[PDB]
Amino acid sequence: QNITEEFYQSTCSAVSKGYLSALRTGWYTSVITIELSNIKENKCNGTDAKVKLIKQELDKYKNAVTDLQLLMQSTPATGSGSAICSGVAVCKVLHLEGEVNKIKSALLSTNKAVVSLSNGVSVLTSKVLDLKNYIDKQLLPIVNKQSCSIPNIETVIEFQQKNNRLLEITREFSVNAGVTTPVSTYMLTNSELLSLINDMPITNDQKKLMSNNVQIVRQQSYSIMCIIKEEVLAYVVQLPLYGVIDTPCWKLHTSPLCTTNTKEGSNICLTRTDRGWYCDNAGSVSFFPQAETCKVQSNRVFCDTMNSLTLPSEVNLCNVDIFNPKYDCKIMTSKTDVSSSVITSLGAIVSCYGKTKCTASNKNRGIIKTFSNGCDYVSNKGVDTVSVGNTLYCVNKQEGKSLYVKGEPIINFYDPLVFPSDEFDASISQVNEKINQSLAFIRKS
Amino acid sequence: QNITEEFYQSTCSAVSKGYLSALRTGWYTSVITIELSNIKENKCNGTDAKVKLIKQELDKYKNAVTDLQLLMQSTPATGSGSAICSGVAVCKVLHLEGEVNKIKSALLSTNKAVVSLSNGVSVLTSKVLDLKNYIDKQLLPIVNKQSCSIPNIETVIEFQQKNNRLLEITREFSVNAGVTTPVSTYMLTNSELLSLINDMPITNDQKKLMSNNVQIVRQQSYSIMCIIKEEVLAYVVQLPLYGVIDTPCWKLHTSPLCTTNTKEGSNICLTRTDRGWYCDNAGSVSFFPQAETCKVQSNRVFCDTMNSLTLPSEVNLCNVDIFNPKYDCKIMTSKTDVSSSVITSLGAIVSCYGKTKCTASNKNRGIIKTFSNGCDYVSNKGVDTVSVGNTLYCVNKQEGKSLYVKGEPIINFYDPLVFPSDEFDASISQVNEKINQSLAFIRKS
């Protein structure tokens, strides 16, 4: 994939092109079980040091089970309810009588198994930890008599190792009110996640996509606590299904565009708004305004469409003609005599104003470019850093082609006397009507 | 508790009612001690593998103590100073000579004990870990001679388990400059927190409230590091006292209300501001503008009044008459031809504009409602999801009654030519004076 960039001198904005989409549009739920031991406290006149270590680890196991129980007695509402109704439907199905027995029977001989629940959902279940078998076979002979049997020291170490995953899963589920994201290796080991991906009802390119980007998959997944019932701890892992794949995506970068008069109080400014990620999606454009909601890897963007707005494809014409009548290109006009810079995919936009010292350097050649007052741009070819005032930024050294599209700054087309300055959420046509209305009060006068 | 909701078609806003408050108004401080061992390094010609393991764990203990020491030599200021003066007053009292000896003497025979400090505060102290007794009884005979004694392997495991809590407490206190929130199970185990709640000078309903919502209590608590002095590590846990209980609380949801003309550039919009949580409090209303500052459980809201504004109770009349002269109902008027949705407690508000495809579906019946252009609403009765453009939201399936309050959208009462569009922080009366002022320039002309 070839990454290219285009700087528009007329609007002080840049577009980084050539990116491929992977937008989340669906969910795949899966049940993760941990087999627990329904045991009660036994005291057996025990004092041997190995028995003490075992009972200590057993009390940490009992407190972990009761803590998970108080999590299902009262579950605090979360801000994620608009994205977890699928996993929640699976957890509500699990509360029916006989359904946990159903997954418990299917996982009697194997760790993984497909189970058709009583709500029409054919989920993939697995058993990642078996504490009922371990406690009842290796531990119960110790606390289960008049005097305690002595366990070997290997059992003490193996049980602290096995019980550890229960304690960390209980910690993540406890602090997050039963809904965690991202999904940690405690909730699902990388081996278990990759094995779950291979067994999903998805295409082979989608298994290769999710398997090569497991950390992004984890960051776009949810782990939801279901129930502790009948010696079973069940929780749902909700994994993303990327319904939009390989559609063009581009990132818009914007910076203030002011006039450069030498007398303060006579300058006006404008800045394009709605900078962020754009991806073609189903005849429209999916826009991602928050900056961290889209993870980038090698020219592929992984977004969740729940963090998007749906815009007409004509929004791209703000990049080709900001004065274009098919879409009303949005701007803001607060004045700004302060310098700033934006590091793009293949270069840097610099808005230099006032007395600020703006420059672009190469590590071994020194200063190779000095920006004048106004908005300018430099590619990463031969440039390592950009300095604005007392701040030094690093330019991304990724390969690609930049194109400097020369053009007159549109802020110069505006009469300062009637310019509407201080517009927070405006548009090109909004500014033009405010100019026609301020010009009519002078036309009559 | 019955949750109800009301959608106001006239203002594109909804109010979710029926919630009970629990607002934090006071603090209960408590001292948590860890008994340390004032020991120095001893080298004893040791090479046996068990001795090596013990000295390794002992060096991790010494580095944890010196790290806590450099935390009290220089404590970085935190953004939490406006909420921890109570716990800080207890830590400053502890620095007096003889006060740490006082808590150290009261906890000579028991783990928990009430102590009257020299500043008039009767605090509940406890001793959650005893490393001085363990190191001096089980470890000192090993490093304390010409040649080292051999410890049994159970001691090596028990000491790594005991020293672990010191290392994790030191890690949380080190990365957070001595002030951590929420309070982790390392700072205070769930068993210790519940035991502390039972012993507090609070009513039995307040102990039941805090004990049934321990994770919310932890998230609204602070752990403050006090001192390492004379073989004692002391830190304060500051727990919330919920002075406002069972007062009505409601959540306001707002969405843009535009006109739906078919020609772009001729539409105006308004949006109610100050969406969030409202609770009746002491003759006024406590408003919570940040969304995540109030945790919800089963119809109970748990807020910290430090994240609130105090408003007159007439602010509720924006929900009954936005044109009401007792309170100046605030709005913003930026234009917005972009569609959006808000998931409420019992349904969903949809602002559909332009060509956006807005719908509400049931999982098995399909699309059951198509929104027209404008602001509309649908209850969760029979609805599972809402789709706006390329985005699908899940509707909360909580039981309650919704009421659709029909009314003419107030944006239709405004002449577009003189509407003040692009108002960031405005009000209904603010907009009306700007309309009277723009109408006077035309009245004379």
Place this chain on the structure above:
Amino acid sequence: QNITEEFYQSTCSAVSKGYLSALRTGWYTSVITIELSNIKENKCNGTDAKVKLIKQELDKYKNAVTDLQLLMQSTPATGSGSAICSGVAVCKVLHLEGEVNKIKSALLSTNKAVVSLSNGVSVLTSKVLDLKNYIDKQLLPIVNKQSCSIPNIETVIEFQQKNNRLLEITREFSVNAGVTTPVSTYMLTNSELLSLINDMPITNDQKKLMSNNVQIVRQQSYSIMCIIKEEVLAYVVQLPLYGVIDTPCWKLHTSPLCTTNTKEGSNICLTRTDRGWYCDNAGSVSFFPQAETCKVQSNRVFCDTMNSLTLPSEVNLCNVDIFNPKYDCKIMTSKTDVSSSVITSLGAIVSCYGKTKCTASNKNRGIIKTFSNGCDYVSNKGVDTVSVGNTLYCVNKQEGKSLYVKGEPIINFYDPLVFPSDEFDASISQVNEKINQSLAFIRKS
């Protein structure tokens, strides 16, 4: 250092003076190596409990190595690229053939060593964990034959302890796409960080500065994953170099300034903008608008100049004469009949409006000051808390001198009829031109 404060009654703002700077201007990169064992799976008819524990820990080691391998096959782009080009240049140099052999040879006999890479960077390398020596000397004799040798139980415990740091480093590098900040004790122990500081090519006062503020140094550092190659795991720790030291720094606090007419709808307001941290820097002022980007210790501020704007030193004259022609003092004018408070370094600003009950109390004397309507201030001398409505704030009890600079509130100099209210990003001169333009439409009429 003497901390002083100045409240300006005329503009409802305060300046906390007397702070010394430490601004980050450069980076010092360092290579951290972990010697790994290139081993493949061996199965040896083993069933003894100690052998099982060892093979389990060995599988967790192999999955940690393959997980780090999939992190270097595909590295997701991060939002930190503008600040890590130095460490990234070191990681790219490491990918050259023979360069990892170079650091591997220099660290053949010692843990720490200076290495001149093939890109002109003289970095300090160290070897914090040696798993190749441990696995090949203590573990290989177990899995390396027809039947497995039996390890002693001390080896099982020592290997779980040693392998633990690899698993936690792999976890932090996995969830963060190879770039972590702050730098944890797993990436670099406090002992290793202090040893690295002592060996840096910096002055003795800078080593004392960074050694006394290690947690702030960690929070302003980066750990970047380099490569797993030829039995070596290498990653770069990028530590801050504080190029600006002991320059004056001050913190500006602002609060709304309204008129106090008794009839709602007749009041206007203004609020100074650009509250935050200011530090003198290289003939200009470095301004830090985000509040948490500057850590404060004992009168020293530690900022990263990447989170700053560069302003002329005349910006300080907004504190002495807001009407001063050398710098256009910025304000916003949204109306606000809501009360609020700002806790400063030595007191509290209170903006009391409407019916709000504002007061300042001492813990033992009770209410000692009642604020009237308007903007006022109280020092921390004798004051413990400030209550505004239903909210109680704690006043910082730090010693210093406050100065109450009396003056007429400038909002009273404005005619309400022509005031531009609802200005989002304005200035004193911006407001004056809007008043001259609204007065010209009345002058002719």
